[PDB]
Amino acid sequence: RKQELVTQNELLKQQVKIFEEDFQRERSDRERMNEEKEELKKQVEKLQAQVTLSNTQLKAFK
């Protein structure tokens, strides 16, 4: 049992290669997702800002 073993070893090496390829793919997707989360974060930042200013205008006018 020495040749089935070497063929399993080459298959396993290519399997490791494709697995870390997929890992980098998912990491890239997660990076872009973090970018989109930061976009949404800045959006809620300015929304909170205008909410607080309209709140202080309301509280002052009452």
Binding site: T7, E10, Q14, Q15, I18, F19, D22, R25, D29, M33
Partner: protein
């Protein structure tokens, strides 16, 4: 001119054919609308297998006629595909086949989406654009298939609790396929499920492109 082609199971297809066409032309139309290669289909009329090269007019074909498709158990060229597990696949291929067409045949056989497949022939990974004659893959040669952990497109589903699962999908996929994946990852029978997107709910017939379900879209699951 319209002609009918029925399978033994009951399926029908309708083809526009001119009487001058040869049986090879009709087999080409059948693979166009069917995928089945011509070296695996035999066409039958009134009991007899029509022979290639002869035209429809040699057999008195007029409009409204009915031919019968019969699939062969094999074509003229097969190769062997080995996995990391111990299973070997005898895949019927044409020599003019691209690597993507071969991966699509692998998908029809075992179910793997082709973007989750990598094929090795004597150390070289095979680009999808190339064909078998490019790599000079002859008949009965052995390839290695390694499977990915993910394809190019994934979507999200919110389960019956607020938890998120991810699905490997193709735009090609119908909502029945999506419900089957949800079953395989969650255990709800597909017709106990309702899928909601953009406030709408998705019938089991149309694909994900028909609803513009883009990558990383978030579906909601409901029990019925």
């Amino acid at each position: 001119m319209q002609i009918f082609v029925k399978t033994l199971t009951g399926k029908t297809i309708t083809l526009e054919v001119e009487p001058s066409d040869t049986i090879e032309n009709v087999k080409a139309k059948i693979q166009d609308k069917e995928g089945i290669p011509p070296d695996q289909q035999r066409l039958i009329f009134a009991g007899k297998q029509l022979e290639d090269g002869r035209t429809l007019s040699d057999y008195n074909i007029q409009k409204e006629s009915t031919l019968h498709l019969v699939l062969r158990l094999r074509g003229g060229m097969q190769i062997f595909v080995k996995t990391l597990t111990g299973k070997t696949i005898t895949l019927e291929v044409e020599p003019s086949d691209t690597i993507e067409n071969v991966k699509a045949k692998i998908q029809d056989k075992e179910g793997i989406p082709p973007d989750q497949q990598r094929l090795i022939f004597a150390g070289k990974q095979l680009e999808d654009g190339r064909t078998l004659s490019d790599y000079n893959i002859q008949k009965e040669s052995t390839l290695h298939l390694v499977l990915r952990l993910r394809g190019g497109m994934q979507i999200f589903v919110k389960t019956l609790t607020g938890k998120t699962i991810t699905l490997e999908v193709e735009p090609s996929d119908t909502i029945e396929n999506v419900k089957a994946k949800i079953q395989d990852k969650e255990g709800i029978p597909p017709d106990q499920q309702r899928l909601i997107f953009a406030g709408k709910q998705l019938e089991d017939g149309r694909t994900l492109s028909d609803y513009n379900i883009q990558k990383e879209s978030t579906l909601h699951l409901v029990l019925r």
